[PDB]
């Protein structure tokens, strides 16, 4: 007796580095509006969080997907699936969802992350989560009305947190540069918000931008190999506010065979959703001793 | 008594940042040697053959690349504390015969209870430097005139320059009465009763002092309208530290400040830490944006 639902993916706004922010009208339509959307990527998985015309959480309609660019010119495609708490495909079932005819809220999160008691999700350092934003038009929340089957277009999607990037090179004198386990540890980062704080997502709530701490940390163990021997590691931070405080980035790596260990302590700041804060490092030998130098843009706003 | 004609050596000019075996040959074999700038002043502190210091035979030159070649030639002259010329009336130096020592400082500044220079930030010393073996004191033999052959001299301490570019929607960028203020930088008011300079003792890479600071009020203008600030600064261990650059500047008529954060840096004595910083215009809004280059070590 009900409608089914066909969700059609919207894609996403990838992250990007910063660059000195539109201090105007809340929704944003400027900031966006020359961005290139990305398709969703291939094995991802998004949730689809339905409320009623009064925005109150309707669980029954909850429901996650698994994307595959298998689409006509390598379109995204959304599949029905099953999911554990973190957002991971723990089972084959594809059990379509069906709703009453309606007007209804929606709101999409990628990884298909479960909601806690607060109506959003539990989110720490070292991941990514994109998500609804109400801060972009392009990304705000938006409201279909139900009236056999119905196609439900989704808006696209942006970055709740930010993303640090080290790209370490192998200079004068290296000739194997790997990870050792201990990889990079950045520290002094925001710790996690507490699950006692409320949260209201769906009128507007996001992510502060709070004072990190000395003993917040999160591990980046895995790296990428380029062409000219350079590895490349990427991880989530939390919004925070370190331009009082120290960031420091420890590197362990294995220089021609032998551990070694670099310290990048990082003062002035200011980590926000939807930006990378890209570093390049190379791993030199001056004489017999091995250097780290590095390079990263920065930007500082007028305080007059 | 023999007359000294003292000869200008030149000087090795301040250079970006680029191991110890001291004394070092190596270090400025390949570096060309400027002439000493004209209207500049050199001190000429003479010690005897056991390196003590010899106060009747202290003598302050003016430089004037008058030279019959295009080269330096140094006057006799009557200078301030600061070495500044107050009198160019020409006394020549007057020494009898033996073996001594000599070091040079410019500019001409009067040398305090321990025998060196009183030194802050926001000034250039050029001095003999014991670290390198072409900079390095020498001695001489005196046997009715001489000729003294001056060895080259080196900068004592770290230089600092801003490049200020006028980028996207920059009509006019200068500098406020405010100018650039660097803090963070090594405190000269901690002062060391160990210092010996004759036998080899040089400026510390002290950690610097949030406290210790110094004022750039003049730029000159590139053609692009990009704006140049430098000054001196004592050598500072900026590695775990921060030095703060606040640059008060007149963009498009209105006042602005921004906060350069640097750290990863050790400013060591003859070399530049230069920086080059964009102010453009994202929206209506004004910005500052620059390069980083840090470096550090294995730990391991
Ligand atoms: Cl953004
Ligand atoms: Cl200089
Ligand atoms: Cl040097």
């Known amino acids: ?82 999911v554990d708490d973190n957002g991971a495909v723990i089972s084959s079932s594809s059990t379509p969802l069906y709703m009453k005819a309606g007007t209804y809220y929606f709101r999409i999160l990628s990884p298909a992350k479960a909601l806690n008691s607060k109506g959003f999700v539990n989110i720490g350092n070292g991941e990514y989560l994109l998500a609804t934003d109400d801060r972009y038009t392009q990304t705000a929340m938006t409201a279909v009305t139900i009236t056999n089957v119905q196609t439900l277009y989704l808006p696209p999607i942006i970055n709740q947190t930010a993303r640090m990037q080290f790209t370490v090179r192998a200079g004068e004198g290296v000739h194997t540069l790997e990870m050792l386990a201990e990889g990079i540890e950045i520290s002094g980062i925001q710790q996690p918000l507490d699950n006692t704080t409320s949260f209201d997502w769906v009128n507007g709530d996001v992510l502060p931008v709070k004072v990190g701490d000395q003993s917040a940390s999160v591990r980046i163990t895995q790296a990428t190999r380029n062409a000219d021997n350079s590895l490349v590691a990427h991880t989530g931070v939390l919004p925070t506010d370190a331009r009082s405080h120290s960031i420091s980035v420890l590197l362990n790596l294995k220089v021609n065979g032998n551990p070694t260990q670099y310290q990048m302590l990082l003062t002035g700041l200011y980590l926000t959703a939807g930006h990378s804060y890209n570093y390049t490092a190379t791993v030199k030998i001056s004489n017999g001793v091995t250097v780290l130098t590095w390079q990263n843009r920065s930007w500082t706003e007028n305080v007059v």
């Open 1 to 82: 007796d009900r409608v089914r639902i066909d969700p059609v993916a919207g894609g996403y706004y990838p992250s990007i580095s910063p660059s000195a922010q539109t201090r105007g009208a809340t929704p944003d339509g400027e900031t966006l509006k020359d961005r290139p959307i990305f398709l969703l990527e291939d094995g991802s998985t998004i949730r689809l969080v339905v409320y009623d015309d009064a925005k109150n959480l309707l669980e029954e309609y909850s429901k996650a997907y698994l994307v595959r660019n298998a689409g006509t010119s390598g379109s995204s495609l959304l599949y029905p699936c099953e």
